[PDB]
Amino acid sequence: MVEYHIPSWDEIEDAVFSIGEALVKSNYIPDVLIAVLTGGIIPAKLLSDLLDLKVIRYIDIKFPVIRSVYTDSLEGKKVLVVDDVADTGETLEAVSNVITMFNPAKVMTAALYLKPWSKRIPDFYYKQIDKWIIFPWDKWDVVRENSNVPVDKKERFLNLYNQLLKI
Amino acid sequence: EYHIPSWDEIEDAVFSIGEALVKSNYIPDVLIAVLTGGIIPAKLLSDLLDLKVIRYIDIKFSKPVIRSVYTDSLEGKKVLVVDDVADTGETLEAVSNVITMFNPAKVMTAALYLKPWSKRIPDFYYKQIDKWIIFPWDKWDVVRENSNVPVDKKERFLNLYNQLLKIRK
Amino acid sequence: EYHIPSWDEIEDAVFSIGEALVKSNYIPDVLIAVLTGGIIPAKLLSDLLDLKVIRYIDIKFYRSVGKTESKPVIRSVYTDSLEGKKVLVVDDVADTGETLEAVSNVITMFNPAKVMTAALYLKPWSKRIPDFYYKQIDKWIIFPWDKWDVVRENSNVPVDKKERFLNLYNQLLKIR
Amino acid sequence: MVEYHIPSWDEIEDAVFSIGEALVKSNYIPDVLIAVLTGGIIPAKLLSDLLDLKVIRYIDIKFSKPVIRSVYTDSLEGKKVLVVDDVADTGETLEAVSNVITMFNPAKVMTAALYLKPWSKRIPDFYYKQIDKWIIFPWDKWDVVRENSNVPVDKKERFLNLYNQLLKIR
Ligand SMILES: O=c1[nH]c(=O)c2ncn([C@@H]3O[C@H](CO)[C@@H](O)[C@H]3O)c2[nH]1
Numbered sequence: 001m002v003e004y005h006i007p008s009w010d011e012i013e014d015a016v017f018s019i020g021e022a023l024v025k026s027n028y029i030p031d032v033l034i035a036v037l038t039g040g041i042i043p044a045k046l047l048s049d050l051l052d053l054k055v056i057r058y059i060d061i062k063f064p065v066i067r068s069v070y071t072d073s074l075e076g077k078k079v080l081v082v083d084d085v086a087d088t089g090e091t092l093e094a095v096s097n098v099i100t101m102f103n104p105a106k107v108m109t110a111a112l113y114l115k116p117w118s119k120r121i122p123d124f125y126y127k128q129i130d131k132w133i134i135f136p137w138d139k140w141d142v143v144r145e146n147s148n149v150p151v152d153k154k155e156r157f158l159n160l161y162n163q164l165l166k167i
Numbered sequence: 168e169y170h171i172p173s174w175d176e177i178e179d180a181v182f183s184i185g186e187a188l189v190k191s192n193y194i195p196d197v198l199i200a201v202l203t204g205g206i207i208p209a210k211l212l213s214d215l216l217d218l219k220v221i222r223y224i225d226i227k228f229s230k231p232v233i234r235s236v237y238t239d240s241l242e243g244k245k246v247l248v249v250d251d252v253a254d255t256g257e258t259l260e261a262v263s264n265v266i267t268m269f270n271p272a273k274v275m276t277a278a279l280y281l282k283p284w285s286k287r288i289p290d291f292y293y294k295q296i297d298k299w300i301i302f303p304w305d306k307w308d309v310v311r312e313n314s315n316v317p318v319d320k321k322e323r324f325l326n327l328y329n330q331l332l333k334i335r336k
Numbered sequence: 337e338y339h340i341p342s343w344d345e346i347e348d349a350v351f352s353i354g355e356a357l358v359k360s361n362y363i364p365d366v367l368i369a370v371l372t373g374g375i376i377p378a379k380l381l382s383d384l385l386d387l388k389v390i391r392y393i394d395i396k397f398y399r400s401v402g403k404t405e406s407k408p409v410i411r412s413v414y415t416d417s418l419e420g421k422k423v424l425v426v427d428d429v430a431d432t433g434e435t436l437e438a439v440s441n442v443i444t445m446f447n448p449a450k451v452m453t454a455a456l457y458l459k460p461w462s463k464r465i466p467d468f469y470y471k472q473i474d475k476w477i478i479f480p481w482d483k484w485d486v487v488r489e490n491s492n493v494p495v496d497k498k499e500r501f502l503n504l505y506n507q508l509l510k511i512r
Numbered sequence: 513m514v515e516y517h518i519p520s521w522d523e524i525e526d527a528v529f530s531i532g533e534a535l536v537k538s539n540y541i542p543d544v545l546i547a548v549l550t551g552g553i554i555p556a557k558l559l560s561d562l563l564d565l566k567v568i569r570y571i572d573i574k575f576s577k578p579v580i581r582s583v584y585t586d587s588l589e590g591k592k593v594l595v596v597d598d599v600a601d602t603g604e605t606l607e608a609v610s611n612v613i614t615m616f617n618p619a620k621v622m623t624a625a626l627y628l629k630p631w632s633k634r635i636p637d638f639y640y641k642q643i644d645k646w647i648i649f650p651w652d653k654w655d656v657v658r659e660n661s662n663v664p665v666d667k668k669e670r671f672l673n674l675y676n677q678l679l680k681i682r
Pocket residue numbers: 039061062063085087088091131132133134135138
């Protein structure tokens with residue numbers, strides 16, 4: 001495609017496999033995943049299942065503004081911050097900066113996709129991409145802004161959307 | 168060498184800050200208590216000005232370390248950070264920095280006591296002091312961290328501490 | 337995936353900048369070369385326009401996996417007074433545009449008469465368009481003066497004289 | 513009241529002692545001093561001797577807004593930096609210096625001036641005293657006398673004789 005990258009769940013799985021394999025190759029097995037809410041939710045859960053990482057914590061950030069930090073002490077822990085895309089890099093910057101104030105043993109970052117203009121390059125990523133990424137978990141947000149985007153099941157979504165608006 | 172405020176002096180420190188907040192027309196929407204030294208000051212200030220929303224940040228101080236941040240969204244709120252003493256000023260700096268990341272409408276700071284060398288001056292404080300302060304709520308910590316500390320009820324404390332050490336895991 | 341300019345093209349890029357400078361009636365009193373990618377462009381531009389005053393700024397923008405910060409870092413500024421001078425900042429590529437932005441910001445504190453910027457190549461996503469540039473390019477550029485860094489850091493890099501480079505790199509390892 | 517504050521060298525030493533004591537108590541021992549040239553020259557050297565700080569670097573800046581002429585330093589990355597000047601009047605100079613030094617990505621930049629005026633836009637992190645009138649320092653007293661020869665400083669007669677010889681040979 002030319003404007004959009006619309007990864008299948010199959011590709012999302014392979015992105016996570018790719019980051020997992022790179023973590024193992026680097027010998028960086030995090031003690032704690034910090035999922036960036038809410039784009040990093042699904043990548044962090046899949047990565048957790050893949051590598052059997054039992055400790056996931058969360059930071060609610062909107063873009064960046066912190067709304068909440070859901071974690072206990074990280075002192076002396078190896079942390080991996082997980083997001084779905086690093087576009088401007090501002091989110092990873094803000095999250096790295098605040099997590100560093102918890103004095104972890106180490107902070108590394110991971111994002112499934114990287115834009116070529118990001119001010120922060122994740123330690124781990126699957127693909128650098130210069131198109132707008134429509135993820136399986138924000139496809140309806142994208143459709144609500146632009147109905148033309150070429151995603152599956154749009155008809156069923158649009159029927160539901162119309163019923164919602166009637167409320 | 169020590170300044171050892173009575174609880175009566177602590178009450179007057181809180182009144183002074185509450186009076187300053189009202190004079191300045193800065194009535195915060197949210198108090199952020201610096202744990203654990205800011206606990207008592209924040210509760211007393213909250214009681215005094217009927218400030219119903221208190222949130223908390225667990226920070227310990229060669230650098231301040233954040234252990235947890237106990238708060239919901241602060242966006243668009245007027246926040247007042249509350250601690251008991253600003254000494255190096257590193258704690259207020261660290262807390263102000265992280266709270267600013269929550270995009271509050273405003274952040275101001277308060278400490279009961281200020282040391283004259285602090286790297287961060289609070290917006291509100293009661294007294295500038297150059298002695299080490301023994302607070303009523305950390306007097307036993309000061310006893311445990313020093314050789315010979317002149318506080319009331321020390322002999323009752325030491326008898327209890329002796330028994331605590333005898334049975335500790 | 338790479339744009340790999342010949343030295344012939346680099347010369348033409350510098351000509352193109354010099355031609356644009358003259359067309360804009362902006363003949364710099366001082367070139368500020370961004371070290372170290374702007375070194376060779378600034379020297380060639382100086383020879384072309386007979387600009388005798390080149391000064392330097394050591395600035396890096398770490399954007400690698402493992403070596404990453406959000407902003408460029410100045411290490412040193414090699415210049416004396418620029419007050420009242422027309423300055424041109426010269427670099428080889430503007431990618432994010434942060435480097436040109438940072439250098440412009442610091443040079444402005446020297447109260448020049450004017451600061452303008454030039455880069456041989458511009459990426460489509462730069463935050464600001466340099467005042468002068470040769471071409472907008474979206475491929476990763478391999479310059480003649482950082483081709484061996486690219487070879488050391490990336491796989492399957494197709495550059496001329498790679499044979500001679502790897503032979504030397506082999507010898508370097510034996511004494512490193 | 514008095515027109516000028518005219519500190520003795522004894523007072524300048526005490527100002528430097530005061531700042532040095534505050535640096536130690538506040539847990540900020542600098543890795544590098546950045547002396548603002550040329551008023552911060554003598555304060556920085558005295559502070560360096562007091563605290564045994566071996567790394568002094570320099571910035572040539574003059575003050576509509578401050579103008580940097582040169583920055584005499586190598587990499588400051590990861591270092592604790594203290595900027596040192598003699599007086600903060602508008603605060604524009606410390607603002608400009610802090611701004612450029614921050615671009616060197618130090619671990620931290622803090623500022624110090626011996627004296628602070630109340631209308632400064634920037635309050636230095638460390639200072640000795642607040643003053644709300646003109647200060648004549650031991651190191652710029654002759655510049656002041658050249659503007660107004662009535663200012664009450666010592667050794668003025670010797671200076672004026674020298675100054676008269678200088679005015680000739682031009
Ligand atoms: O679905 C997205 N695809 C992208 O390529 C992309 N690039 C940037 N963003 C933004 O990331 C922020 C995360 O907090 C959101 O505001 C998105 O607009 C993106 N969202």
